[PDB]
Amino acid sequence: GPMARSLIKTDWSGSEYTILGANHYEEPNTGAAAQFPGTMAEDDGRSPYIVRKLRNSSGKRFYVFTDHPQQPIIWNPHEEIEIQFSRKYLIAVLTEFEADSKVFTHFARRQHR
Ligand SMILES: [Mg+2]
Numbered sequence: 001g002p003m004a005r006s007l008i009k010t011d012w013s014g015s016e017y018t019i020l021g022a023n024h025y026e027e028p029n030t031g032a033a034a035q036f037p038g039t040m041a042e043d044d045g046r047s048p049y050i051v052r053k054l055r056n057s058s059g060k061r062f063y064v065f066t067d068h069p070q071q072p073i074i075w076n077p078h079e080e081i082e083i084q085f086s087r088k089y090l091i092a093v094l095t096e097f098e099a100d101s102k103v104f105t106h107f108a109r110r111q112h113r
């Protein structure tokens with residue numbers, strides 16, 4: 001795939017998890033099959049976050065985790081939202097069911113193994 005992608009799909013204990021990097025890029029209006037199109041970030045050093053404005057280009061409803069403990073946010077099909085990726089992690093964990101944010105820690109640990 002192109003270098004611009006930063007996206008992993010994996011199965012864990014019977015459910016699928018999408019791990020989205022804060023540096024994922026798919027150009028809006030790409031002719032390729034797109035999943036999370038949107039421009040590159042707001043990167044303000046005064047902020048503990050990097051913000052990405054992305055569209056969910058699918059028929060999936062996601063619960064999105066960027067830290068733990070946290071209540072997830074909900075990302076419906078075709079909607080454009082701003083995700084606040086934490087500078088600590090620079091990933092978001094996406095699931096199609098309401099998981100507990102402890103799932104985030106599982107992937108955060110694995111990122112640096
Ligand atoms: Mg890449």
Ligand SMILES: [Mg+2]
Nearest residue numbers: 067068069070
């Ligand atoms: Mg925390």
